[PDB]
Amino acid sequence: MHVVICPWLAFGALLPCLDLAQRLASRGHRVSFVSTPRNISRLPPVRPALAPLVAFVALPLPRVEGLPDGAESTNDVPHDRPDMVELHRRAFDGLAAPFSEFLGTACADWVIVDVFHHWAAAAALEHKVPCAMMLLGSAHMIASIADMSLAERFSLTLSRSSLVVGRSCVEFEPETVPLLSTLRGKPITFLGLMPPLHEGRREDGEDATVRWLDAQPAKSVVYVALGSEVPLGVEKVHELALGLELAGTRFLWALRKPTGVSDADLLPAGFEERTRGRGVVATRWVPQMSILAHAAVGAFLTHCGWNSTIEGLMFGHPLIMLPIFGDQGPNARLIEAKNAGLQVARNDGDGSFDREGVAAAIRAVAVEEESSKVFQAKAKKLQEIVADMACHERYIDGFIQQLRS
Ligand SMILES: O=c1ccn([C@@H]2O[C@H](COP(=O)(O)OP(=O)(O)O)[C@@H](O)[C@H]2O)c(=O)[nH]1
């Protein structure tokens, strides 16, 4: 089949969609991977032996005054600037005509699109190509949904879609997946957990962060990362910083800077000085796969993005969960329900947190002998499912057979 994949302008979407693209190409299916030029330049290089079977289609974002040149992703357009977020959404909506023009001449058997791509689902109807809507989250997340705005956009894409795609399996969610066959009438297929193929991401294993981990003792480092886009204000960064200090663990912290915050104001006064030997803060893109693979990393303080949840658990790491928005909350609950993680206490009404809640979560998961060994033993039990690569390939084989019918 010639499958056209158009992921949402977010590395949380672009990365797993490129893994999918390559898993399809490995079965000898042609993929057209449709996105913007800079997002594509920033992706892992394709496996050379699959290079002709993953065609990249670079649709330039229309230049919307106010959205600066290169601001093509959620990683580039900050959430703490709502104005720019909307300019990014409008520019993304400007890809409609060029996407329609492309799909016309594509000879496409399927179009797989994200929930934001109402205009791509429209082009699929225009050119009589069956359109699968990606909801590459937990079965629990989809159950939670089932129970122009983004909701209008979701409703509109879903109505024009023949199929809904989830990223889980009965092995990981026996309670949800069996009874979850449709979403507002549209049939749901789960393509497995699709854990990343480590080689696949083509990260730098000589990165300073990984060399730093080599020096640390086994299962001793709390990796801290909130994925690629979720906002965290300077005040909240400070609470997370002081929380990491108070718990007293070795930490590696992949931190994105809030907008308009100097390197001087970003962290608490003397924070790096006081933690020099024990902790490392990186305000750049880190090789997350290499870090989580490392024997020095014990627990993972995550925002519970589904990619990060799956990456964390495939290397048997118990989770310290700080969900910010969207799928994160339900993803946190599901892991908490499986006793392989603990949520940071949150003030009800505002969803805020403090250094004390942060510290108590880290202690319970990573420090206190009895609680930590429970969380580790349970993360390891989940690892048996999440890292069963053969299982998740059989689910990709299953998903292809679904597309043929
Ligand atoms: O410094 C970083 C930040 C993010 N990621 C990757 O970006 C993806 C983020 O996806 P997730 O759903 O976990 O969070 P999102 O960015 O979608 O909120 C994951 O695959 C991470 O491994 C990374 O490799 N290094």
Residue numbers in the entry: 15 to 161, 202 to 459
Structure paper excerpt:
Here, we report the biochemical and structural characterization of OsUGT91C1, a glycosyltransferase from Oryza sativa, which is efficient at catalyzing β (1–2) glucosylation. OsUGT91C1 is able to catalyze the addition of both glucose 2-1-R1 and glucose 2-1-R2 with roughly equal efficiency. It also catalyzes a third reaction, β (1–6) glucose addition, to create previously uncharacterized compounds. The enzyme’s ability to bind steviol glycoside substrate in three modes underlies its flexibility to catalyze β (1–2) glucosylation in two distinct orientations as well as β (1–6) glucosylation.
The mutation of His27 to Ala completely inactivates OsUGT91C1 in β (1–2) glucosylation at either end of any previously assayed substrate. The inactivity of H27A and the single binding site for UDP leads to the conclusion that there is a single active site in the enzyme that catalyzes both glucose 2-1-R1 and 2-1-R2 addition. The H27A mutant is inactive, confirming that the cleavage arises from the same catalytic machinery of β (1–2) glucosylation. We managed to obtain the structure of the H27A inactivated mutant in a complex with Reb D and UDP. The Reb E complex indicated that glucose 2-1-R2 had been removed. The previously invisible glucose 2-1-R2 is well-ordered. Three complexes, native OsUGT91C1 with UDP and Reb E, native OsUGT91C1 with UDP and ST, and the H27A mutant with UDP and Reb D, bind steviol compounds with the R2 end at the active site. The trisaccharide attached to the R1 end of Reb D was built into a weak but unambiguous density. The same flip transition of glucose 1-R1 was also observed between the R1 tri-saccharides of Reb D and Reb E.
